């Protein structure tokens, strides 16, 4: 702010002001609020809580069976070298 003498800035907005209204009042709000609809315990989703496999491992079962059977052919006898 600058004040300049001799033209000085009025020393106030004075008493000639026009009170325009008495509408100043905010009427307090008084209220009762009830949000009470029956609630049912459940919601349907496509899927909740699953941690789906991105790849599975290979998996398997097992079997064996049979017996011990055989047809054989042997090497001929040979002269013994030494000993």
């Amino acid at each position: 702010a600058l004040i300049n003498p001799q033209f000085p800035y009025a020393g106030p907005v004075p008493i000639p002001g026009p009170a325009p209204t008495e509408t100043m009042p905010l009427l307090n709000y008084r209220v009762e609020g009830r949000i009470a609809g029956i609630q049912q315990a459940r919601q349907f989703m496509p899927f909740l809580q699953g941690p789906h496999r991105a790849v599975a491992e290979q998996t398997y079962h097992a079997i064996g069976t049979g017996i011990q059977m055989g047809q054989t052919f042997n090497q001929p006898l040979i002269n013994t070298q030494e000993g």
Partner: protein, 49 residues
């Protein structure tokens, strides 16, 4: 075609549950909110950003 060859479009998850099963014009309405106009005939858009 401008939707006349389609009954509806949708995005559906594994339980048969549709999150936005809409007739073609309503589907187009959602797109108009995104690009301020329609895509060319037969072109349908879905925003999941």
């Amino acid at each position: 075609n401008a939707g006349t060859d389609i009954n509806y479009l949708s995005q559906r998850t594994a339980n048969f549950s549709d999150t936005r099963k809409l007739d073609p014009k309503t589907w187009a309405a959602q797109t108009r909110r995104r690009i301020a106009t329609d895509f060319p005939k037969g072109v349908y858009y879905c925003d999941n950003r």
